[PDB]
Amino acid sequence: TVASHVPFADLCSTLERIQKSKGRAEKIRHFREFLDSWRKFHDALHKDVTDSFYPAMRLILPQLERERMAYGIKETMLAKLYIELLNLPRDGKDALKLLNYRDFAMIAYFVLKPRCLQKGSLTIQQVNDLLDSIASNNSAKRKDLIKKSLLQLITQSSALEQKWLIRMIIKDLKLGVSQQTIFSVFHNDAAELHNVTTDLEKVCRQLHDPSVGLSDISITLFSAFKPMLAAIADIEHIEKDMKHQSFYIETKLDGERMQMHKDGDVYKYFSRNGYNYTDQFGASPTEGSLTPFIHNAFKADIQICILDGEMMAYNPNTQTFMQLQTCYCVFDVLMVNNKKLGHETLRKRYEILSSIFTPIPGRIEIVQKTQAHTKNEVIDALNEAIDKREEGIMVKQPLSIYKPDKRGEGWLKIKPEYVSGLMDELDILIVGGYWGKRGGMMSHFLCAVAEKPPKPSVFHTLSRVGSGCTMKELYDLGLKLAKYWKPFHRKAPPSSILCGTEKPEVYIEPCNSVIVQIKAAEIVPSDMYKTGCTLRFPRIEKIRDDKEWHECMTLDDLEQLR
DNA sequence: GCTGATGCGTC
DNA sequence: GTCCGACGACGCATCAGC
DNA sequence: GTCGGAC
Ligand SMILES: *P(=O)(O)OC[C@H]1O[C@@H](n2cnc3c(N)ncnc32)[C@H](O)[C@@H]1O
Secondary structure, X not given: OOOOOOEHHHHHHHHHHHHHOOOHHHHHHHHHHXXXXXXXXXXXXXXXXXXXXXXXXXXXXXXXXXXXXXXXXXXXXXXXXXXHHHOOOOOOHHHHHHHOOOOHHHHHHHHHHHHOOOOOOOEHHHHHHHHHHHHHHHHOOOHHHHHHHHHHHHHOOOHHHHHHHHHXXXXXXXXXOOHHHHHHHHOOOHHHHHHOOOOHHHHHHXXXXXXXXXXXXXXXXXXXXXXXXXXXXXXXXXXXXXXXXXXXXXXXXXXXXXXXXXXXXXXXXXXXXXXXXXXXXXXXXXOOOOHHHHHHHEOOOOOEEEEEEEEEEEEOOOOEEOOOEEEEEEEEEEEEOOEEOOOOOHHHHHHHHHHHEOOEOOOEEEOOEEEEOOHHHHHHHHHHHHHOOOOOEEXXXXXXXXXXXXXXXXXXXXXXXXXXXXXXXXEEEEEEEEEOOOOOOEEEEEEEEEOOOOOOOOEEEEEEEEOOOOOHHHHHHHHHOHHHOEEOOOOOOOOOEEOOOOOOOEEOOHHHOOEEEEEOOEEEEOOOOOOOEEEEOOEEEEEOOOOOHHHOOEHHHHHHHO
């Protein structure tokens, strides 16, 4: 194998040459120099071949390391680890410079310059093996061995080789060249293949010959693909960006992005960046937080499947999602049995997705898709979504295919525009409530502002806001206020709360109530509230226990804000 | 059993 | 307009010391 | 995820 015959110092030399290079091309040139040399050596050495550039690549692009588990080490633990071995003074200057560095690599390089041995004898593979050892020992929760392995690494290397090793352990090289540049240099199809593998060794083994190339590249089973993303659409321009044809509107979830590979009783789960969570959601119907519950959800004719969706936390008590059990909400299928669905239209994918399994509420579901045409519908969807305490809405082309790691390209996400100023902090009082349509708690609150006192007494309603119970602090707030709600009588209202056209279902006297910090996009004129204005896209950012009920912002503050 | 420190991967 | 590299929040995990 | 700089 090649990695056994190549000194780590040469790699470090290349990395140094790349780092100190000013322009995009020189960097590319030095890399090319190294890579070409490596390939030549490979050709010479091997004359069945599993060997490839991977042992180098994984060091060159350590952020793409997958096979090796986490090191369990960052700058501080490394400083703590290093200071012990060299036996530096505990309180000494060097140790102090290490300890608080705020470029840890460089600072560590200058400290080890006089201390380190003349120079290192280790190859790339040895380094790989020792790093493997560290990761493994970390996974096994034994530090005593980690110390040993790292010590072996330190003893056999030059200062420069370790500044690089450190930067490989931190998994940031700071070369000044993007990974796609590296990939473009290595092979023309490298990026394309990495996007549907997220396996550096796969990429390095398959594409080894720069002249040769792959035929059909696409989603595989048990191979992590970089999920398709959504660009931010801009406001009014939407109608033109959807092709003017019919389009899907669906809800914008805050879960985590998770894709599920299934064969029979065997399962694999991958995250956004291609990390394997299978230990969590489980590899089999007998283990994990998810798979056991969803195993019988699938239809009998389903053998092999690939799904992409948003993993959510579902409260069985309240029948809602909390930003208690793990729930997998699935918006796409890239594979079913012997058929690869990746190239089929979104419509077809939804059509198939509906048929592969039966929803289990709170365990596994299908995202709701609202077919739409007109901008007004999008607007309505946004404004309605915010009262559910969503973050926005999603809009998609029914005819668009799945394009891994492509932001935009048929997927759009709409959020409201929020100012970075005080329009994101308005501390205002809950003076009212409405009941949800289940719906056994307050769905929305009615919120108000006060007038400048010589406590206050009279309040003027400002805006409604969706109170739906999606975080604990909302339910707790709900519970705390139960005893204090009173039925609102339109013919005989309370004098403490002055209301416009909009009247609540129940009120609460301000002294028993709570201040909420509400962000909003902006203040607009309204005939429905006493202030004569309301909040566009209001949401509750925080509940305030640091503020008493009398601390509510006045009409003067609001007038100042508008 | 508790708690602050430190790592890891996410949106 | 595009790429892309610093940012910060969160939840969750261990674990040393009390 | 968002931001803001270099092209
Ligand atoms: P916001 O910009 O905070 O979130 C956007 C990302 O959320 C994920 N996502 C949520 N809901 C969906 C749906 N329905 N389809 C696809 N992706 C979804 C994506 O990762 C967004 O980029």
